[model samples]
Target: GSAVPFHGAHQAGIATPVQDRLHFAAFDVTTEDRAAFVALLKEWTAAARRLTAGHAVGEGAYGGLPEAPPDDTGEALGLKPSRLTLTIGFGPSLFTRFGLADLRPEALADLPKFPGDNLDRARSGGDLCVQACADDPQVAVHAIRNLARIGFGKVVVRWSQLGFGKTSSTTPDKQTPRNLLGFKDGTRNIAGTEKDRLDRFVWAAEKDGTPWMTGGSYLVARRIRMHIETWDRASLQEQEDVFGRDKGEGAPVGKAKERDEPFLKAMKPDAHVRLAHPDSNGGATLLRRGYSFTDGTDGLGRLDAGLFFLAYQRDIRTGFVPVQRNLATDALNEYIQHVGSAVFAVPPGVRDADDWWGSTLFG
Candidate 1:
């Protein structure tokens, strides 16, 4: 019974308390027929509704119809809901192909190549994306796997990222999570309960010139490879100086507790917290829901481990762009490389049983 509601004006998993595991899939539409494509979206949405409700999709697995291609793949047969949530987004390329070019929100475009970016094309852009999050790792994986199976003829997965140990938290009651570098991440992150901040910084408005995007949001996903080998060998003082926070207490420089108000002047000029602070970036804030990942070794003794950085905001230009540009000269840049990136315009959620994902745009 660990379900996140599937009906709302805004989608689940965006500001929902950060889940313990993530299975994110970027998809490239293979079908050219607009009707067929929209059909798949409906099918997927129905299945997503069933998934989060702890119900087996269509006919129960191994039950009715006797293998009429089992409705569910069966891996999650006995698993609880685990607070599962499925969120959908439409990418820039999707607008062009669907005869909805005029509907494209101006700011929903490809991310500019950031400084020190070594992005891989294989893991980059897609026409659409589905973010499935849950407490059980298997539950997360199974959702995407089944979605991929359901979409066999109409769409192909462009890339998939499996992650655990969420790098940030939206609920402030728990201890802030640490990144692979051992520094507390998102110390001043927007809380899931803060609707005022969410409306100001995260939710798109009709005044932004896109009617369908009203109450919608934009998402920026980046796979940042942390140079842990280099960071692991650095002295504690150097690490603290780079991040501008004490490792033990996660307090700002010259502060005692983790929640102490940071004195920006006390930190080094290029310190991470200093450069990423809202005051430094003209109040550009983001609702971050990042996660840690460790893909196997690089075959050269180093691990391919990093943070799967995810940010949701009202506008990309005023949110991610300005903040990222301000971080160009950050000292912590030395230990990380952004290797994968994608952006999508996530519309508002299904409001009732008759509503489906993307109905506002496609209807």
Candidate 2:
């Protein structure tokens, strides 16, 4: 397929079909001057527009000034767009700087501590984040590399994660993919084609809160570490009991098909599906776009593997908080630990050439 459009009512990366690779980076703002900060955003906007269109930044990679550095890093010079989508997000910390406090939405607050969080402060939060997704890993990496290069002293990379093996599907037509757990993920995910559902559950509307976030959404990022060795050693029946699904077919406990209605009562009291279900959490739902990740060995003969979970919603209070609260005692919790986490308020997409990232709120 060709590249996804860069500008729209909402960011492409969120609803766009899951890509094969991701270069997710969180950044810390180094500049305190509001003007400089805003200027960097404008520069980023221009560069992003070009990169997503499969064009090099400024002049051609090798045709720029002989003395001055080339505008683009030249890594993606001959590559296709590969359906690349760059999505930007502003963390709650960003609002506290550059006199942006009053502009912050009431719903934009730090996430509360969960029951099983073993958070690492270094990888947990940032002032901003850019989720670069593409079918090609190098293309995705090139986009973030150039953006960071352009940012220079204005922003510094706080933390980054490279992920592959998408664990969620945004459209019903796409077959469900497996997480590291070997169960089909996102069987009930909100599809991108579901306009009514998207509007109600994913896009933030004017009546929701801040006017600037009318078409925006909130993002919750978590790095969940899976205990692979323990899980691999467990019996198939125990593994199935943990997720309340057939390991092979991914059908619910009492169902014969993957899409069959999950009979929550048939599952155990602490089954992952039963607790994470919307019915148990005031009808809350999330648009999950998680990816499986492996950062090699933990250096102790075990792999540091897990899900780099990314989810978007209209509001965290109703969407993620309640659902996580319900999963505080989920049996799956025993095998996974949340090591990193953060939240960001994703602004609406750039509407035209005149619009830039955060222009709605920055204005």
What RMSD, rounded to one decimal, does every model reach? 2.1, 2.1
Model 1 bad stretches (over 4 Å)? 166-173
lDDT, model 1, position 218: 97
User: Candidate 1 on 78-168: residue-level lDDT in tens?
Assistant: 8899899999999998987878889899869667877899999999999999999998888988889889999999999999999986423
Tens-place lDDT digits, model 2, residues 1-363: 768999898888988777888899999999989999889999999999998999998776897679989888899978999888999999999988988888888777678888889999999899999999987889999999999999999999999999996423343436777888888888899988889999989999998869999999999999999999999999999999998999999999878998999899999999999999988887899999888899999778999999999989999888888888888889998799999999999999999898999999889
Clashing pairs in 2: none
Q: How close is candidate 1 to the true structure, as a TM-score?
A: 0.97
